[PDB]
Every structure is written in C-alpha cells, then in structure tokens.
Curated annotation (Swiss-Prot):
The active site is at residues 7, 825. InterPro entries: Cas9, Cas9-BH, Cas9_PI, Cas9_REC, Cas9_RuvC, HNH_CAS9, HNH_nuc, RNaseH_sf. One of its GO terms (molecular function) is RNA binding. Changing residue 964 to A: Only cleaves 1 DNA strand, probably the noncomplementary strand. Endonuclease activity on target dsDNA requires Mg(2+). The RuvC-like nuclease domain should have 2 divalent cations, while the HNH domain should have 1. Crystals are often soaked in MgCl(2) or MnCl(2+). It comes from Streptococcus pyogenes serotype M1. This is CRISPR-associated endonuclease Cas9/Csn1.
RNA sequence: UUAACGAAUUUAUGGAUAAAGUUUUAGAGCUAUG
DNA sequence: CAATACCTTTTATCCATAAATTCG
DNA sequence: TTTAGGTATTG
RNA sequence: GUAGCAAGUUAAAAUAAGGCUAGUCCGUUAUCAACUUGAAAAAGUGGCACCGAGUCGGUGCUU
C-alpha cells in the first residue's frame, strides 16, 4: 500500500512516500522522554543533511611525513653513533649541546653555544662561515685538518637534507664542463678512428647540447654544426647516447640482431659487454667517455653557474647568492639613504611591513617582498642592474628556499664524498667508515618493501630473513627484498569473483590460456551435408584442433579450421560453423612465446611440467627488477640450457586475469570426479559453457560456490567495497539506513516500489568558429565581430557555426532578432550543440513528428557537409541531419533515441540497486528462482529535471532546503508512473532478470518523447484518465493527481534532519604560535611551557559534555552549583573516556552528577521558547535551527523571476512566463516581508536585518530580474546552518554569530532518528 | 571494463622520497642621552 | 558581556593496484 | 579551494 | 625609556600530545540520535482512519 522515493547526493539523502493515487501520508508518532508532549503528527516525507565524506588521501599524506620525520632523526642518529666514540675525545658534551639547542638558557643544562662551548669561538665561527654553505666549500676544498665539530656539522647537514632521488646512477664532480667532456668524446673517437677522424674545430658544444629542446632536436643541431655526418652515422649514435636518447649501433656494425643502449634503463652496463665483446674491449674506453658526457648534460641544467674552480659547485652556488645579496643590499640600502631616506625606517626596520625587515624578521615571502619593493625600485636612479635582477627573480635571495629540491641528492653526495676524502688522512674512523657513512645519505627504503614492521603495522607487508634490527648497511641480509616485491603486488591483486578465497591467476598464465581456448571451443557447432542436425564439437576434436592448429600458429581464423582440420583430417569438403565468429578470439600466446625461447615442444606438452610453467609466468609477470627474476628462476636453470635462460629473463608479462587455479582445475564434482576444465573438453553431445557449468543444479558447482561466498558480510564491507567517491558512499549507507527505517514505520511491511536517483568551455566557443571560417574563407567573422564571453547564448552561438544561413531554408539571417527564430533539435526531444540548430521556423523541417524532411535535405545536404569539413558541425549532427535519406528515424532507430536516454549508465547506481533489491527479497519460492516482491527502479535525474520545468514545479536551491525531499517526491511520482504504463521496460529500468525486446516501436507509443503522457495537452491530444492498455490498471489522472502534487510540494512541514557527528581528526590548528601568557596555548611537548617556547591554539572540540556540579568562587572559595557545557577536545577525549569523573574533577568540577552527564555531538538539536531551533555547533557556539517555508507561488515565481538562462522553452509559453513576472510584481514586497517575521521568530538577528530592510528600500527602481536575484542572497541569512556573509547589490552584510550557549541549557533537547520521525525529547532543569 | 583483446585519462587505496613553512634558542649590536 | 575583526601549513617527485570512463 | 569555528580586543 | 647608526641571507631542535606491541612501528579516513540487551559486532523498542495546514492541528474507533 506504499512506495518509497529516494534522491541521493553528496550531502543529502532525500526521501518521500507515495500512495496508489500519489498522496504523501502522515502519522502520529510517539515522543519519548520526560516532556509533556507525548505525541506528534509528521509527514512521511523528509531529507537528511550531512557533512561530506572525507577521503583518506589527506590523512595518508600526513602519514608519509610522520614516517619521513621518524626516519630522518634516525639518519642523523646514525651519524652520531659513528662519531660518539671518537667525538667524546674532542668535545665531552658537543651532542648534548645540540640536543638542547631549543631549550631557553634557564632550562639549558649545558653551555648556550653549540658548536663550541665558549662564547668567543662561536662568534668567530659565524664570522668566518656565515652559512653552512660557506663551510661546505672549505671542508671540500682545503687540505687543512679541519675541526671534527665542523666536519660533523657539514656532513650531518647533507644527511639531514639529501635532495631528491629522482635520478638513478651517479654524477661526478669532474663532469660539469660539457665541452671539456665533449672534446674527450671527440678525442677518444680520434685515437680509435684514423680512417674517419673528426674535428671539433669551433662547435659550441655548451650551447647546443644543454638546451630545453627535445632530446632529438639538440642531436640534429649538433651534427648539423659538424661538417656533415649522419645522425645514423656512428658519431651521432654516440651523441644521441649522451642525449637522454636511445640509439642503435647495429647499422654501423650490421650485427645480426638490434642492440640499442639507453642510459636511464637498467639494461645498460650488462648490454654493453654483450655488444662490446663482438667489436672488442678497445672500444669500451669510448663508451665510458660518452656516458660521462650524459652525466655532464644532466647536471648542466641543475647547476648552471661556472663550477671549474671547485669540487663543490652547489655550496659555491650558494656562496655567490650570499655575496650578491650582501652587495645588492648595500646598494639598495645606500640608494634609499641617498634619495629617499624617509621610507628607510619602514623598509628595513618594520617587521610587519613586508620590507626587507619583513622579508627576514617578519613573515613575508620572497614573492611578497619582491612585489612590495618593485614600485620603489623604479623611482630611484641606477635601478636597472637591480630591476633586471628582480624580473630575473634573483634579487636578495635566501640560500634555503622553495626552488631547491630540484637539486638531485647526487650533487650533495658529491660534496659529502669530497669532505670525507679530504679529511680521512687525519681521522682514522672517517677512512674506515667512509662507505658506511655515504650509505646513510644514499639509502632509501625501496617502495616495494614497505614499512619495516614487526607484525604490528596494518600497512606493512614485508618479510624478513633474520629477526634482527634493520639498518641501511645490513638491509639486503635482513630483508627479503624479492618475496616482499611479490607480497607487494599480491596484496593489491584482485581475488576470484566466483571463488573469492583463492587468488587470481596471471592473465598470461598458461592454464588461463587453455581454459580460455576451450571455453570458446565447447560452444562451436558444425553442420555438414552428411549430418541431419548441427552438433557440438565432440571430445576428440577439441583436443585434436588444439594440438593441430593452436599450438602451430598464433591466431586461428575460421577458414583455417574448415581447410586445415575439417577438410584435411575428417575429409569434409564443405561445412558451416555456427558457434565461432570470423576468427578464434582466444590464442595460446604464452605457449608460442615460451615455445620460441626453450624450443622443446615435447617440454611444453608434458602435463608434469604445468606446475613449472605456471611459476615462470607468475615470476615473470610479477617482478620489475632484472636481478630478482634471476633469483627465482635459478631453481629452473638445470632443466635449461645457459643460452635459453638469457632470453627468459627478458620477456616480461603484464596483466592479471579473472579466475583462480582452484576454480578451473581444483574444484571437482563429487559425483563426476571431474573439474571445470575437464568438463570443457568431453562434455558429451552437449558441450556446456563456463557459466552453464556453475549454473547446473545437478553439478556440485552451484552448491560448492555458495559455500565459499556466504562464509556474506555486514553492511559496511558490502558498502565500502563499492568503487567510487568515498563521500557518495556515505549517502548510500545513509540512504540504506533510511529505507530500513521506513519499513519499520509501515508496520514491518515491504513496499511495492522503490525509486533511487543520484545527482552528478568559455574559449572553446571562440576556437570552433575561428578555424571554421578560416577554412570556409567567408568574411562573416570580419563583417561582424563578437567576444569570448558571449557564446554561452545558444541562438548567437548557433548562428556562428551555421555561418548566418539557416540549414532548413538557405538564406541570410538577421543578427538582431533571434527571439523570433526557433532553436530546432535535429531529433525531437537533445539540447546540446550536437543536436541543436537555429532556423526562422521549426515547421520548415516538415512534420515535427518526422526527421527534417527530404525537401530541406535536397536543398541543404551540401551546406551541412561544408560545415562538417570545417568542424562547424559534428559527425553525429550531420548523420542525424542526413538520416532522412536512410529512411529517416527508423522505428529501430527511434527506439535507440529514447531507450539510451532513459537508462542509467553509472556503475555505482547499479550496485546501489543490488544493495537495495537483495536486502528486500529474502524469500525464495519452492523453485530455485528468486521471488521479486520489491521493485527497485533507477531513475535518471534529467527526467524529473525537465518535469518540474515542464509542469510548473520550479526548483530554487537557495531559498530553502526542502527541495531535497522535493526531488525525492518528484522522483517517486515520475518513477512509478513510467513503470505503471510500461511493464515491457521493467528489465530496462528495474534490476530484474525480466527480459525486454527492442522489436516493438503492446505497440505503445509512436512518439519518440517518453515524457508525453503526463501532459494534459501536448504540442503537436491525450485523455486526462490514463490506464495501461493490457491490464486496465488506472495509472494517471491529469485532473486528479496533479492537484495533490503541487499540494505536496507546497507542504510547509517536511522532516529535515542534520546527522549528528562527533568531530574527529586533527587536534588543533596546525600552525605553531609564538610564546604567550595565554591559557589557551596548548603545549607542543611536555617539558616546554608554551609561555616560554610557544605552542598550539584553537583545539577542535570532538564533542561537548553537559556538567552539573559545584565550583569554588572568589577568595571566599564558596561552593556554588553551576550547570554549563564542557568541551571535550580530540586530544582530551581518550583521557576523558577512561575516567570521566577523575577527569572532570581535574578540570575543576566538584560533586558532579554522574547520572546526568550528557555527551552532546556536533549539530545537536535544541528547541527553546517559541519553537525556534538551535543546533549546537560547539561547546561555546550555536547554529541556525529553522527552515523558512516560502510559499510555492514565490518559489515558482523566483525561478521565473531570476530569469534562469534567459528562456529555453517554447516562445508562446515564455510570454505568459514573462507576464507572470509583472502580474506577481508586487511579490517582492511579500518575499521581503516573509523573512522579517521569520527573522524575529527564529533568527534573532535584528542588528543585521535592519540594514537589510533599509537596503531593499533603496533599490526599488532597479529592474525585477536584477532585483529578485539579489533578493535570493538574503535567504542565506535565514538558511539552516551556519551564519555566513551575504551581499545585496553593492552592500556586504556580515554574519550574526551566537557566541553564547547559555540559552540551550534551559531548552528541550531533541534526539531524532535517521528519518526524523521517532524522537525522545528532554527538558533540561538543574 | 566490452557480445572479445588493447590503449588513455580520471578517481579510489597503498608505498618510497623531496624542498618550504612555523616555533625556541645560538650567531656579544654599538654610540651619544639618566 | 555582546559585538568586531582576524585567524586558519603548503608545494613538489616517483612506483604499484583497482574500478569507471571514453577511446580504439 | 573557501568554511565556519577560536581567539583576542574594543568602546 | 628616546633619538641616531651598524646589522640581516645561516644554523641546531620539534613538527599532531603521545602509545606499547618498543617496530628505522603506530597516532587526523571510514563508522555514530535515544532507550533496553551486549566486551563488541549487533539485535530489540514507537495502534489506525478521517477532516484539514505556517514547520503539525483536531476528532472518531481500538488502546
């Protein structure tokens, strides 16, 4: 006796209920709690607002740093351990001094100066080496024994900040000068090639090689500079090799197989000797020279400056930035003193101003500083060498900035290496541990390994060789690198859908190939002259054809089968094959690729080897790393020749299949003794298909399958497995929590129908006209020009693609009056450009039930082709225009018109259908087949979208929140109506497998527009009492039903519930705050009084708790009873939950009433006084309660008043829509009045409302379309939810925030259920 | 995922890295003047 | 108090898997 | 990428 | 304390409090009205028809 309609979105689930005759019911509901209200009537329509679902990504990123920090403090801890023994000899508490660098002198346990204890030597230090970068150069360059404390500072400073690992290989300090390296590259070629010696002459190798151009264009530009040699010639192959390019040297030496050499790819050191051996070892001296140049090129962009004087270019690059800053500061500081010495105090002394004082001491970015002084620079003289420095964006640069990190960790390691090498003679431990220390800088946990856990991390998957602690130096021995790399993918690879306990096999698995061949072979039937009836392929032939034709060639065409097997082996000269199509879709691709390498056809056939051949593909498909493949295959090396193994390691397989090994060959019928595969050959006269095998009740497969699956799962897992946005899953869970409650309301009765629906270029317009009049060559673009912001107007934009001529008439069209000209769809209702055309009269096409007629096509079949070749129309647009010559829109073509429009393509929505449908129909009849009690309809959203505009139910989002229920109601109406009149479409719209045939075009309707039967009158007749033709059921009464629908829309009571949510996540605002004497300053770490060190602020409040107890007041300390709202923060919450009372007493409460403590989540609901509602937004803040029921005449008005997208509809309807504006013109005063009583009743903001009231008074003479739209802003003041700022016309009206929660404490608390219908009300009295 | 194989983008989940920011302290501020 | 005004870490790089989506 | 709750200070 | 002037670019340390399972692990996602039952997962709990409509109001029968 009822039906449910849903409208699912990101932030709301909308829900309404419908009757046989389309009324929405009501019911008296019990009210729990101590309040005198014992009952309420509420309508069975509602919606559920909620905060969006938050993705894990934001969280996961925090995790990356969380590990990034606990691994970096470990790296420095690693250097310190190396020094600990040796350093204590030099400085007893050097490391201690650093640990406590952050403590204030009162809390410091040692000397205040870190690098050296004494005040004198530390000042000398910054005197000589102002930057660490200054020091790095000296530690690299000098030969003098430098203090061990400095060595540590430099080395630890490189290990703390490595730069990035985005390069693999090594770059050298020698390799910066490309020309110096280039000449060696030319030079070696000359010591080897006296028959064709080359001369570098005066080629500019520096400029040509290191350029932002293609790796290809630079190659050509170089050899062009040389006297003329081929890029295919050997020198170019070398030069290409330096360029990050892959060249082939086969052409020069004409080697039997191609051997290319790329410097990024792994296969280079190994590939060299396999190629190098044939030419001989003498050449190799050349190839290393080329590799060196590559390393020269690569860092040619990173370290652009001259680096000839030093082995530490990076620090040298910094030292230059420092001195330039010093130089240019004085010139800037001086030139301001010289000409403008009044602003200098603002510039260099005011921290807050974004001056240099702001740049250094204030919080001002180089982008903010550059901007602020650029005006000053150009008013004083000599400011060119400094202004060119500012446009260069290199002026008064800091050394540590945002653009670094383009630095590759290798150049740091270069300075590290130099420092170690320099000072190892002086310090023995440096020379012993040099390699041990360098690995600290170079080591990176390989991603496939994952976090190195000891079974106590969710994310980890790694495997360990020894249960001992992991360090960068013993990493290979302790960690099973390979078996981790497999576990790495195996945990992300899918499971078998039919048997979800077993792993999916590789897509190129040999067993997968056979199964995939035989499943196509079993359903092949052959008909011959000798035979009366077609017969399935029998057991021998499948096994014959496979041995004969599939092992011999990659793909098997139908002609090969009739010729090679049927005619040759069975001697049938002619035959017809029904089952297979033109060629066999399956192939034995792994067989032949494996057959070619190992070359033992006997080997691939011994079923004893199937275990061994599966393993090679699983290892080959799985693994990326060349070395690790070898480690797995070594066990196989004895079976194989040493040359056979070489090719095996190369072939890699990509992809994962669908089905398990156990499914195909493990599962066995208890009675037949046979597997899935064994039934795929030899299934008797009837050869059964794979689906058929699982779906045969005589076989144990349907019974065995069901055992694995049910062993199924709770709702979360079923919902969470859903693929798609993680917030739209929330609405799903909420939409399904809604349905389960509606059924409870209806006395635990299941409903007949359920309707679910879910909601989801400016310059493009200029370019499709720009180039389409360039190839047309017409002057209609020059004759009248237009702009890039205008073309979102349909009629203007259609003219320009049309070129000023109508496709239906062939004449020049006036630019000024497009209102009289109709926008015409090629196919009667599509509103996109692909199907939109603008002509003076839409009847010129002929019959508006017909395709644009043969009369206009013969006139204009040519003009629309000119537009196609100029991309002024799309192939779909042209093919629907010309379709008149393919007999027009065929019944079978017109069926494709409507059917494609109605069905929902979105995979998520479909899954929602299952979720609902399977949760409803638990009963099964005596047959195996399921009983379809509840019908789950998926409605497209557009249908209702047009229905409201078509039938005067206009939707305005921002006036109100009722439209969420409104769309649910209106999805419920159009849904049940479309299935009442069309049960042939049940299979198309309902998740139900009935079956629907395209053939009809039970005739039903001629008209290609599905949404016609609702219409009382239709633009060219329909009876106002509709009934299905076949059953006689009364489906739609245009007179009777439409009255209730507007009545339901214009209903003033709808249940709107905002889901209550404990707030989770970050403790507090992330920013660090400078020291204060506040008590809201949260400590950063325990030993740090925020008053001395600075701390956090602005804790988020996880939930509020209501505390009724006594507190001490005054020096008198008399105990007086207070009832107030305590904020439990996220940091607090864990501590709170263990012991509430001890925790409460710690915050200052005494004699707390434990029974009465109430935990108040965010968005919790309070009604006080005159029914005004407040939602508790914080322990200390409140939020707006109430939704304003603007009457339907205004909603319908304001949508038409706002004048949405000018007017889209038919022009004759539009005139009365325009007339509706003036007729109801006085409404504007009614709308503004509505708010005033509602403001005073609920909102309590008179301060603001008065500037509102006083603002509307002034703009009375401005047009309605301009005036009404700005009236729409005003509602945001009335909106349920938070106070936010709104602007009328030119005046911004700030928000009214409720910074007291006192009034709540004496109101009645409302606990509402998911629907909003069941409640428990609680009146609060101390 | 398609009546079947490939490719690509996007979103989701996960891993290994990087450079900034912020905070306290260390970089003896001097010279007239109470 | 209740207004009033101000505040809120960001921005890169690479690897893997999966659906869902639009092209072949 | 803007929300909407902490926070301190004023007339 | 004011007026002058010199100066500045760098560094160490922390980067959710913290937790025990002490790992070169983990600590911001999902999930949540209320009441009874539960360690939890979860299960359980709220008569109907009519007339009407400014955020649900009245009446009739059973209860």
């Amino acid at each position: 006796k009822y039906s449910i309609g849903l409208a699912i979105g990101t932030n709301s689930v909308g829900w309404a209920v419908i009757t046989d005759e389309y009324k929405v019911p009501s019911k008296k509901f019990k009210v729990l709690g101590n309040t005198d209200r014992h009952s309420i009537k509420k309508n069975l329509i509602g919606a559920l607002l909620f905060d969006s679902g938050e993705t894990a990504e934001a969280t996961r990123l925090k995790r990356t740093a969380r590990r990034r920090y606990t691994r970096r403090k470990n790296r420095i801890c690693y250097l310190q351990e190396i020094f600990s023994n040796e350093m204590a000899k030099v400085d007893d508490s050097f490391f201690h001094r650093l640990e406590e660098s952050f403590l204030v002198e009162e809390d410091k346990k040692h000397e205040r100066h870190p690098i050296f204890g004494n005040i004198v030597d530390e000042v000398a230090y910054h005197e000589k080496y102002p930057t660490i970068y200054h020091l790095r150069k000296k530690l690299v360059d000098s030969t003098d024994k430098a203090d061990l404390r400095l060595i540590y500072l430099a080395l630890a400073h490189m290990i703390k900040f490595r730069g990035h690992f985005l390069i693999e290989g090594d770059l050298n300090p020698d390799n910066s000068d490309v020309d110096k390296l280039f000449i060696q590259l030319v030079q070696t070629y000359n010591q080897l090639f006296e028959e064709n010696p080359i001369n570098a002459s005066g080629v500019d190798a520096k400029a040509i090689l290191s350029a932002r151009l293609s790796k290809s264009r630079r190659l050509e530009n170089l050899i062009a500079q040389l006297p003329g040699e081929k890029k295919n010639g050997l020198f170019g192959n070398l030069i290409a090799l330096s360029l990050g390019l892959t060249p082939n040297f086969k052409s020069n030496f004409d080697l039997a197989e191609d051997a290319k050499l790329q410097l990024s790819k792994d296969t280079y050191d190994d590939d060299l000797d396999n190629l190098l051996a044939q030419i001989g070892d003498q050449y190799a001296d050349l190839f290393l020279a080329a590799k060196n140049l590559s390393d020269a090129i690569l860092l040619s962009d990173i370290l652009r400056v001259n680096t000839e004087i030093t082995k530490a270019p990076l620090s040298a690059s910094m030292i230059k930035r420092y001195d330039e800053h010093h130089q240019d500061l004085t010139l800037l500081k001086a030139l301001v003193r010289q000409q403008l010495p009044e602003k200098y105090k603002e510039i260099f002394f005011d921290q807050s101003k974004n001056g240099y004082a702001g740049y250094i001491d204030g919080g001002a970015s180089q982008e903010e500083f550059y901007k602020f002084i650029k005006p000053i620079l150009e008013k004083m003289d000599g400011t060119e060498e400094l202004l060119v420095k500012l446009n260069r964006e290199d002026l008064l640069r800091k050394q540590r900035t945002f653009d670094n990190g383009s630095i590759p960790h290798q150049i740091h390691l270069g300075e590290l290496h130099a420092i170690l090498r320099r000072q190892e003679d002086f310090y023995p431990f440096l020379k012993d541990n040099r390699e041990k220390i360098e690995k600290i800088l170079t080591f990176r946990i390989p991603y496939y390994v994952g976090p190195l856990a000891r079974g106590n991390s969710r994310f980890a998957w790694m495997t360990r060789k020894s249960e001992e602690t992991i360090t960068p130096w013993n990493f290979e021995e302790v960690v099973d690198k390979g078996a981790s790399a497999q576990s790495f993918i195996e945990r992300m690879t899918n499971f078998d859908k039919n048997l979800p306990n077993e792993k999916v096999l590789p897509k190129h698995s040999l067993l997968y190939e056979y199964f995939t061949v035989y499943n196509e072979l079993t359903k092949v039937k052959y008909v011959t002259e000798g035979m009366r009836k077609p017969a399935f392929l029998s057991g021998e032939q499948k096994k014959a054809i496979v041995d004969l034709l599939f092992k011999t060639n990659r793909k098997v065409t139908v002609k090969q089968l009739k010729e090679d097997y049927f005619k040759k082996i069975e001697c049938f000269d002619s035959v017809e094959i029904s089952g297979v199509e033109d060629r066999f879709n399956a192939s034995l691709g792994t067989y032949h690729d494996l057959l070619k390498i190992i070359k033992d056809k006997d080997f691939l056939d011994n079923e004893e080897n199937e275990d061994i051949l599966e393993d090679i593909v699983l290892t080959l498909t799985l693994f990326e790393d060349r070395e690790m493949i070898e480690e797995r295959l070594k066990t196989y090396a004895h079976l194989f020749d040493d040359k056979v193994m070489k090719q095996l390691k190369r072939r890699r397989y990509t992809g994962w299949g669908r089905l398990s090994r156990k499914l195909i060959n493990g599962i066995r019928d208890k009675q037949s003794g046979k597997t899935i595969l064994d039934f795929l050959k030899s299934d008797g006269f009837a050869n059964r298909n794979f689906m058929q095998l699982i779906h045969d009740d005589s076989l144990t497969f349907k019974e065995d399958i069901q055992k694995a699956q049910v062993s199924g799962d709770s709702l979360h897992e079923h919902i969470a497995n859903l693929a798609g946005s993680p917030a739209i899953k929330k609405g799903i869970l909420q939409t399904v929590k809604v349905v389960d409650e509606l059924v409870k309301v209806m006395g635990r009765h299941k409903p007949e129908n359920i309707v679910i629906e879910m909601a989801r270029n400016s310059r493009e317009r200029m370019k499709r006209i720009e180039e389409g009049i360039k190839e047309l060559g017409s002057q209609i673009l020059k004759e009248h020009p237009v702009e890039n912001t205008q073309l979102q107007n349909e009629k203007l934009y259609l003219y320009y693609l049309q070129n000023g001529r109508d496709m239906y008439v062939d004449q020049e069209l006036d630019i000024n009056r497009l209102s009289d000209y109709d926008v015409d769809a090629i196919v009667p209702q599509d509103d996109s450009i692909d199907n939109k055309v603008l002509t003076r009269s839409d009847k010129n096409r002929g019959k508006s039930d017909n395709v644009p007629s043969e009369e206009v096509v013969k006139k204009m079949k040519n003009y629309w082709r000119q537009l196609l070749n100029a991309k002024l129309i799309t192939q779909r647009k042209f093919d629907n225009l010309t379709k008149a010559e393919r007999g027009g829109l065929s019944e079978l073509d017109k069926a494709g018109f409507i059917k494609r429009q109605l069905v929902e393509t979105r995979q998520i929505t479909k899954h929602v259908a299952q979720i609902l449908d399977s949760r409803m129909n638990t009963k099964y009849d005596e047959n195996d087949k399921l009983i379809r009690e509840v019908k789950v309809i998926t409605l497209k959203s557009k249908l209702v979208s047009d229905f409201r505009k078509d039938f005067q139910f206009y939707k305005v989002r921002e006036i109100n929140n009722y439209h969420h229920a409104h769309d649910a109601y209106l999805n419920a109406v159009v849904g049940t109506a479309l299935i009442k009149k069309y049960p042939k479409l049940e299979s198309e719209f309902v998740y139900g497998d009935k079956v629907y045939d395209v053939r009809k075009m039970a005739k039903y309707f001629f008209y290609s527009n599905i949404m016609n039967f609702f219409k009382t009158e239709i633009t060219l007749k329909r009876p106002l009492i509709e009934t299905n033709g076949e059953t006689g059921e009364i489906v739609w009464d245009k007179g009777r039903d439409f009255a209730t629908v507007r009545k339901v829309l214009s209903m003033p009571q709808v249940n709107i519930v905002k889901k209550t949510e404990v707030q989770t996540g970050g403790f507090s605002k992330e920013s660090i705050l400078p020291k204060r004497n506040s008590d809201k300053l949260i400590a950063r770490k325990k030993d740090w009084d925020p008053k001395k060190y600075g701390g956090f602020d602005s804790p988020t409040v996880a939930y509020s708790v209501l505390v009724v107890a006594k507190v001490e007041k005054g020096k008198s300390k008399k105990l007086k009873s207070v009832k107030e709202l305590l904020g439990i923060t996220i940091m607090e919450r864990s501590s709170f939950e263990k012991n509430p009372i001890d925790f409460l007493e710690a915050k200052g409460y005494k004699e707390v009433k434990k029974d009465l403590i109430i935990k108040l989540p965010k968005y919790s609901l309070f009604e006080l006084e005159n029914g005004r509602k407040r939602m508790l937004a914080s322990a200390g803040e409140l939020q707006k309660g109430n939704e304003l029921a603007l009457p339907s005449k205004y909603v319908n008005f304001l949508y038409l008043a706002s004048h949405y997208e000018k007017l889209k509809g038919s022009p004759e309807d539009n005139e009365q829509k325009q007339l509706f504006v003036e007729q109801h013109k006085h409404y504007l005063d009614e709308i503004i009045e509505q708010i005033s009583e509602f403001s005073k009743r609920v909102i309590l903001a008179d301060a603001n409302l008065d500037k509102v009231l006083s603002a509307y008074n002034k703009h009375r003479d401005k047009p309605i379309r301009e005036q009404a739209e700005n009236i729409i802003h005003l509602f945001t003041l009335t909106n349920l939810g938070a106070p936010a700022a709104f602007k009328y016309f030119d005046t911004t009206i700030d928000r009214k925030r409720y910074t007291s929660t006192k009034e709540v404490l004496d109101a009645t608390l409302i606990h509402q259920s998911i629907t909003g219908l069941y409640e428990t009300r609680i009146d609060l009295s101390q």
